[PDB]
Amino acid sequence: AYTSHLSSKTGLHFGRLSLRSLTAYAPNLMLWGGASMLGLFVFTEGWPKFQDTLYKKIPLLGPTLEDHTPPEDKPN
């Protein structure tokens, strides 16, 4: 058949940002979320508040953070 016109629509967007570009970038923006949690654990390892609720419950790397000094060896 003969075509005499083009049929089209307009995609949802706001400025330089579009819905299609957001959908393509969405799976990779979650990996960057997980790469920032991993980098946060590295820098808060010495914080004892985070040790007692998160890091000491790791199966193999957990117990190696516990201190085993007897009370008779501590002045405070």
Partner: protein, 431 residues
Amino acid sequence: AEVTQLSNGIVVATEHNPSAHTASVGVVFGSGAANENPYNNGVSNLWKNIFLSKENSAVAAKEGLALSSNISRDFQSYIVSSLPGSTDKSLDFLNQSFIQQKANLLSSSNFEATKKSVLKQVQDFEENDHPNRVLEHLHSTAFQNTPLSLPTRGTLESLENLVVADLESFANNHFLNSNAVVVGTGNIKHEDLVNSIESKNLSLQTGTKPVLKKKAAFLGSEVRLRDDTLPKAWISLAVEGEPVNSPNYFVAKLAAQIFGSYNAFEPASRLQGIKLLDNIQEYQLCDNFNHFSLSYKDSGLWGFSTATRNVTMIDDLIHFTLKQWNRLTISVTDTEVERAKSLLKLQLGQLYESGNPVNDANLLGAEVLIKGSKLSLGEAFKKIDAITVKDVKAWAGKRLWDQDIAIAGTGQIEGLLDYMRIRSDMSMMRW
């Protein structure tokens, strides 16, 4: 439409077209510039100008025939064009002037005059044709020390040593029945052409062509022919592409169509639906560019060629064009693929469906010497239509994302940065 027969070693293929006003016949050999060595480079260029010599072409004009010849990396062709009904004389001319009798053409004062003219054709090509001599150095640096690196026109230093005895060696090794296809295009029937060939002897040599030891392999490298007296800069940049007999042959071709060509001095070229244009137009970065996808028997090349007068912002031009290549792996859209589909079908329908039977003969003969047949235009349209966005992303992630590149340039190219700065742009740290 294409009909292909076999006869004792030679292959006959035709593309009949009754509406044509001119028939064309000739012979296409399946050996080209990639079948020479760095010491006999330019032999196939001498054989082309010997065929089109003044004395040879004067004989053809009396009968009303016109001659043509083309030299490529893989094939060379010799064509004779004439009016319909004069096809019998064209076959006769080809037989007794090139196929069976080469002694009269290879006489002295005819070889010495032709060699004088070709030596001048390559001297001015090497110092006047800049865009086409950086695309030749791109092949030279990307396929160095492999057969796919020798220029098709030959070398000035190599052509001063060729003698008449070198031309007979090449003819004995390559102009053979097992390396040849007889073609006929325009207003000529398949039955008529094959009947004429068998009515005569029309037999080439008997031996087989020598095989090449090493195949072509891509190497990331660069060559810089800096010249501060020229007014512009010409740059070619490419990655390894696809061979002719590949499943990703049409996907790579469609990928080059997404970025396309550009002319700064054409009002309608500045309105194209290419997202790269809005980056390079605020500051005039280049005068023109084109994206290509060249395929051969062993390998290919995929990239672009540029020419600019903005010599202080070459880095900006390269940075922006390579950042758009990255989106072919991560964020290419559905509208871009649909537009490139329509423009590729138009471009293919303007190359195979032109009005020149000489152009058709080269195209048809070269496609049969490689895969034994010719794919129709209707079937190719069905393959282009089937391409999806997931196909493009898979192909780009394999060939483009974080890969080695080849660079060639000449002119004022001080502003072109080093290899490592450019190669860093083949990927993004934000992804």
